[PDB]
Design an enzyme around this catalytic site. Structure first.
Site, short mmCIF file in Angstrom:
data_model
loop_
_atom_site.label_atom_id
_atom_site.label_comp_id
_atom_site.label_asym_id
_atom_site.label_seq_id
_atom_site.Cartn_x
_atom_site.Cartn_y
_atom_site.Cartn_z
N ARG D 48 0.86 -1.20 0.00
CA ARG D 48 0.00 0.00 0.00
C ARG D 48 0.90 1.26 0.00
O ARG D 48 0.50 2.27 -0.65
CB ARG D 48 -0.99 0.02 1.17
N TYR D 101 -13.36 17.59 -17.47
CA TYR D 101 -13.98 16.23 -17.47
C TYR D 101 -15.13 16.20 -16.43
O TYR D 101 -15.00 16.73 -15.33
CB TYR D 101 -12.93 15.12 -17.28
N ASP D 173 -3.99 18.33 -15.90
CA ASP D 173 -4.51 17.02 -16.34
C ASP D 173 -4.14 16.84 -17.82
O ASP D 173 -4.83 17.35 -18.66
CB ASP D 173 -6.00 16.93 -16.09
N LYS D 198 -6.24 5.65 -20.26
CA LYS D 198 -6.46 6.14 -21.65
C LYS D 198 -5.23 5.74 -22.48
O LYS D 198 -5.01 4.56 -22.62
CB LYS D 198 -6.75 7.65 -21.65
C1 LIG Z 1 -0.85 -3.70 7.74
C2 LIG Z 1 -1.62 -4.14 8.87
N1 LIG Z 1 -3.05 -3.91 8.97
C3 LIG Z 1 -3.90 -3.38 8.11
C4 LIG Z 1 -5.27 -2.99 8.49
C5 LIG Z 1 -6.06 -2.05 7.79
C6 LIG Z 1 -5.61 -1.40 6.51
O1 LIG Z 1 -5.85 -2.27 5.34
P1 LIG Z 1 -4.78 -2.15 4.11
O2 LIG Z 1 -3.43 -2.37 4.69
O3 LIG Z 1 -5.31 -3.22 3.18
O4 LIG Z 1 -4.94 -0.69 3.58
C7 LIG Z 1 -7.30 -1.72 8.29
N2 LIG Z 1 -7.82 -2.23 9.43
C8 LIG Z 1 -7.09 -3.12 10.11
C9 LIG Z 1 -7.63 -3.70 11.38
C10 LIG Z 1 -5.83 -3.52 9.67
O5 LIG Z 1 -5.16 -4.39 10.43
C11 LIG Z 1 -0.84 -4.70 9.95
O6 LIG Z 1 -1.25 -4.50 11.09
O7 LIG Z 1 0.24 -5.22 9.74
C1 LIG Z 2 -14.06 8.16 -18.79
C2 LIG Z 2 -13.50 9.29 -19.47
N1 LIG Z 2 -12.37 10.04 -18.94
C3 LIG Z 2 -11.73 9.94 -17.80
C4 LIG Z 2 -10.83 11.01 -17.30
C5 LIG Z 2 -10.36 11.09 -15.97
C6 LIG Z 2 -10.67 10.05 -14.92
O1 LIG Z 2 -9.80 8.88 -15.10
P1 LIG Z 2 -10.38 7.47 -14.60
O2 LIG Z 2 -11.57 7.23 -15.47
O3 LIG Z 2 -9.16 6.60 -14.83
O4 LIG Z 2 -10.78 7.59 -13.11
C7 LIG Z 2 -9.58 12.17 -15.60
N2 LIG Z 2 -9.23 13.17 -16.45
C8 LIG Z 2 -9.65 13.11 -17.71
C9 LIG Z 2 -9.30 14.22 -18.65
C10 LIG Z 2 -10.46 12.05 -18.16
O5 LIG Z 2 -10.86 12.04 -19.44
C11 LIG Z 2 -14.21 9.68 -20.68
O6 LIG Z 2 -14.18 10.87 -20.98
O7 LIG Z 2 -14.86 8.89 -21.31
#
Ligand SMILES: C=C(/N=C/c1c(COP(=O)(O)O)cnc(C)c1O)C(=O)O
Ligand SMILES: C=C(/N=C/c1c(COP(=O)(O)O)cnc(C)c1O)C(=O)O
Ligand SMILES: C=C(/N=C/c1c(COP(=O)(O)O)cnc(C)c1O)C(=O)O
Ligand SMILES: C=C(/N=C/c1c(COP(=O)(O)O)cnc(C)c1O)C(=O)O
Lengths: 387, 388, 387, 387
Positions: D48, D101, D173, D198
């Site tokens: 992460r 956008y 952007d 894109k």
């Molecule tokens: C990285 C750990 N924990 C992550 C965690 C998280 C965060 O999830 P991600 O690391 O998937 O962002 C949220 N809630 C609880 C209770 C958690 O234990 C750890 O304690 O090693």
């Molecule tokens: C889905 C489109 N565009 C996404 C987009 C985004 C958002 O990206 P994601 O769809 O990957 O969240 C950000 N900035 C610009 C200029 C963008 O065109 C579309 O226009 O169809």
């Protein structure tokens, strides 16, 4: 009949491919979906908003938690982020546990410093601390039980009812036990969330999050915010996480067998001053855990006699506990939280949460009990050699 | 101590990445690897010959089987193909079981017809049939135990020692039990092979094979032939297979618990004429299975009362048994081998094997025993309703 | 109109998902497919026999080559192996080129030694050598044009009509140009095959093969044998290969521009004895290549002045040419075939092919021509400093 | 010598594997990384926070944009979200374009309703509108050029310099053109961000985002916020995105050839009332686009004569333009933005942006020019047949 939760996890997306009748669900990586001619959006149009592979995992975790639906995020921190944006605005108050995951602490504090909401940190196990926090009319109460890493148990029924009485929403972080060992929505919680990175995935090869809402209307708000903030997860990650989920029941049987054997070795062993494990009758929260959990799980921490020199000799030589962060995988892990998992906290939000500096945390995997027990005995014995 | 089978499988990839210390092993998709300057090949040069992700799977399966090394193929049939190419040449004779997987039978027959080797099809459970086959000085004997789909058990010590007496090599197809439940190399086999598609992967999302040789020199010949024939597997498939391997022990505990309960339901049920499951004390080979296996597994077959109408009613309505080919998945499967897994065989090779047209095969998953038993009882009522 | 090769490659599998209308095709990893109730096989039953993701790649390579169908194998050698098994039996004669890929030589010689077929190795560029080989009524002739690594051109129209006069089938290994630059079935070949590892995938992250038959019946036989020997490829590899295919046209435009520029640098440079590249007017087969190919491609080899010390100094220091096996990638590569791609040959089979010990082979990538020329010039100086 | 941007994209992570010398970089899916004995964190500890596969993409995009580093997010909307959280607090004001956008509009307007910052929506192409926005001492100015979907061009040098004189940060952007056709940091911008979904990915099988900061300290703040909010991307998605990037230069050569041929067909064709394409001398912003862009790109929109009935006959029958959202893929797409990409806006934040209801947007792929031209001609005839 409905099936059991173990059957539903094993069979999530099995024989549900309209194209070919594939037994295993196809991976839909596609960012985009064709319209069915002009003005006719299909069920799906863009993966940030909705993706069928991701939605199988959504639906499977919702069925397992007894929710109206599920949202899958890129990380567990993302699922927490999503709940904070869907529910809170400036002037709302949030109650969080004093001993919540360090990453949760870091995020609540940084967003409170900016004024996104007001923060009360309470000890939810102490009725006085809770009623003082609920008296301040909070919009949202976060529960994390058991707590990481001292395995403190929060009374779900009690805290949820006390929170309903003052009109607060409750969200439970159910990462440590997974849906197979604890169903917070059974006790009336509004929201349950996970880091799927841990037991749900189970193979230490996906970082991911999930949020399941009891109510359809709050689920629809989470879907809206997840799309608008761009917090949604990769379909490939959902595919591995769903595959992981299929062995969650099978894995936890072995995790719990191993953890029961290791708690029995550590508790009252000459080199161990204290074991934190809800399965031990001496643990504050044991009876609560026996009541609100289907099992005691496979996370535990313990204080080694002999300070830092003892930890170092214990840790250096382990064959079957990898010194690493995270938990919930098939492979056994050890961590030293002060330095490692809890380094995001200040040295006395750590002392206020009661996290020592001679503390080790075990994530007990599914290896043979006897190999893990040989591994722990050799370490206890290296720690003894340093007095 | 060396560790147990369960520990070995769980810890197969773990903390083995020199680049970053990744716990979970990186996927090396790369077709090619740089030389360390002019004239200096590294450990790897080209993924067809050798790939580190594939070799973690080869190593883990060699450790589990007690072998010198493992070769990973694109399919289970490809593993069989590899062995036939590495060991046999024209003028050699191969002995095979009468009751082997239909796909095995199809390859043995197609290659014998071309003259790659002479084929003897024997019943390796009948000492007479075995001895008649070994009398002809075969180069290689293939054993498949337990056998697909009637769960006939062959005596590994008996057949392997009789084959060694006539200087035949032995290869065992250990697909149905996996290394966790039967180690043919412990009984003296030269070679053990698997469809990794089944229990080793466990998630029905990879087709793959493996061959482990007891002896280093034979392992080296298999590496050479796999490279030369291009039978080696995809690094990505080996990643998924290694991931599945990690839960083999934990999965087999539930599979075997569920299979013990379902055997108990079908054995002596009024609607069931016969059950084939090595765990039943009345199964020919029961005592043999208990001594040469660490468990009875979760494959079984059975014959319903009431002919085709009962089969059709039983099958149409199953909620938790998907009608499909393959086996060894977490998800429970039902097959009719006559018309599916063994359709490649002639009506007469099937008659010779005792695969009837009323035979149903279960691959028992890791769903809740209570649910699998509800589903089966309702099938048994549907079949009963068709007697009137 | 039907569409061009470029449109067909780009649009292979686009808008072909009946389940959700995904633009990009779903990855069907599933080993198995449900029956549609008792006695009712669907289109697919089992991935070893038939997989929809694999078949999108098969279909696309068949459209591109002009064939009845395509079979995708685990490797390129596996495509060769598939053809040998489908077409030959003991007592059959196979004719192969003297200068084929060393791996092909290794398999032809190993299987002839066992007695699967008799082997004649002929120079298919010399009408004399060809006619002596066809006098012996072979079942199958294999052509590899251009040849690896000396870029000898064989006259497809000449060799194929001569082979048909004596009732021999022909198979062409079309790896070095891809279907985008040479269509052997347009010249009447029975079979065309590829290592998809090279230009078709184009990203050096899949090993794969393909065989396209002109005739539906020969295609059905290759399907049967591929299923029965278990030589079929992984659905995931077919997905990456199809993704790579979509840029085959866009990549070859840059590869060929870069190759034309590098040929002009090396041809007549004081440090270069010989260049082997069909696009040079002085290359034997230039005029043949210009008529039977749609381009000259981006494989070439060359011989430095100054023996082994020059080779070593040239190769040490190259920034944009990785010393490695394979070819056809976006990333430029250099190989010394004697000791790498052709090391599987005897010193005598190499002498007979005219693969010298001072020969370097370039696979020219799609980096900036200006950078590849800077890198090659600095190598040529390093080699000069050596005299 | 440094290499060119095309060389660096093609060779990102090529031969950079200490483990095996793999040419293609290995996919590091792992959630966690071992410590090197007690107290010794390696470079990586938790995906992460940091993952080497994701960092190869970060570092490649930072090298292409000329920045100090890059952060890879789960979506493009996530990259915008990350920037809003790293840079703004309540009381800060944000300046955004009026024709940004639709999803950008939705996120700015939802976070502004909560009071996370004050929003000024200006026309950055009009000096008065800009100077009025900049007179309010904004903390951040966001530029989107060219604009989606009317291809309005904003003067990078002018707006960036004017934003510095009032102490504002600028974020551009750069999705529509990618780093290969526009480098906003060359003109002094603080931040450039993309939807990697894109052109950077190019194969319509990854949703992802990226943010590149000019300055090391702002990069380290984005790293910190991405980790704390859990906005970081999947390593699998980074792997496919990096593979995509390797053909960005090769792809855009064909895209731009095709777009030039299609602009010539549409501009002053009897059935086309207006084309919006910066390549046309008549387009407001043409000369700006010729100066601040290396090319005119392959996005264009156009107004069909004959209202809704004409649009419908045009769209229904297209063989090579898929009716779908998104853009930047190898496959040609068409959208009707009112209903499709811009439905997120109110019917008169759209009239303010000047987005009509007879307007089609083309994402021109890399198929053969002639196939796309035949396809567009046939659509123009069907539209004609409705008058
Ligand atoms: C990285 C750990 N924990 C992550 C965690 C998280 C965060 O999830 P991600 O690391 O998937 O962002 C949220 N809630 C609880 C209770 C958690 O234990 C750890 O304690 O090693
Ligand atoms: C889905 C489109 N565009 C996404 C987009 C985004 C958002 O990206 P994601 O769809 O990957 O969240 C950000 N900035 C610009 C200029 C963008 O065109 C579309 O226009 O169809
Ligand atoms: C497809 C099946 N069996 C495959 C199999 C194979 C062939 O493996 P692949 O399907 O992975 O090629 C080999 N050996 C045994 C005992 C087998 O059962 C089945 O019986 O459903
Ligand atoms: C490894 C190389 N070539 C492989 C190859 C092959 C074999 O394909 P695989 O490496 O994908 O098995 C077949 N035909 C030709 C002309 C080939 O060049 C090389 O020469 O570097």
């Amino acid at each position: 009949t409905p099936c059991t939760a173990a059957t539903a996890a094993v069979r999530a997306g099995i024989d549900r491919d309209t194209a070919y009748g594939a037994v295993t669900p196809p991976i839909v990586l596609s960012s985009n979906f064709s319209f069915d001619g002009f003005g006719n959006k299909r069920q799906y149009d863009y993966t940030r908003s909705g993706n069928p592979t991701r939605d199988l995992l959504g639906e499977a975790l919702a069925e397992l938690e007894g929710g109206a639906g599920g949202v899958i995020t890129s990380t567990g921190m993302g699922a927490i982020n999503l709940v904070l944006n869907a529910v809170l605005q400036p002037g709302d108050t949030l109650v969080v546990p004093h001993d919540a995951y360090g990453g949760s602490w870091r995020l609540f504090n940084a967003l409170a410093k900016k004024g996104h909401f007001a923060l009360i940190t309470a000890d939810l196990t102490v009725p006085r601390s809770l009623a003082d926090a609920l008296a301040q009319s909070p919009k949202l109460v976060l529960i994390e039980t058991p707590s990481n890493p001292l395995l403190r148990i929060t009374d779900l029924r009690f805290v949820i009812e006390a929170a309903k009485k003052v009109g607060a929403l409750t969200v439970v972080d159910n990462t440590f036990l997974s849906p197979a060992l604890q169903k917070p929505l059974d006790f009336g919680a509004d929201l349950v969330l996970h880091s799927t990175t841990k037991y749900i995935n189970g193979h230490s090869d996906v970082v991911g999050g999930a949020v399941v809402a009891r109510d359809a209307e709050l689920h629809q708000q989470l879907v809206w915010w997840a799309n608008a903030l761009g917090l949604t997860g990769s379909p490939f990650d959902a595919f591995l996480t769903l595959r992981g989920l299929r062995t969650l029941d099978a894995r936890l049987r072995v995790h719990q067998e191993n953890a029961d054997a290791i708690a029995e070795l550590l508790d009252g062993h000459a080199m161990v001053n204290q074991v934190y494990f809800p399965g031990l009758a001496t643990h504050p929260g044991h009876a609560l855990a026996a009541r609100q959990q289907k099992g005691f799980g496979a996370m535990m921490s313990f204080e080694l006699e002999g300070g830092e020199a003892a930890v170092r000799a214990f840790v250096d030589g382990l064959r079957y506990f990898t010194l690493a962060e995270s938990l919930g995988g098939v492979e056994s892990l050890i961590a030293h939280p002060a330095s490692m998992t809890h380094a995001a906290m200040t040295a006395e939000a750590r002392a206020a949460a009661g996290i020592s500096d001679g503390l080790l945390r075990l994530s007990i995997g599914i290896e043979s009990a006897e190999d893990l027990l040989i591994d722990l005995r050799a370490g206890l014995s290296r720690a003894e050699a340093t007095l």
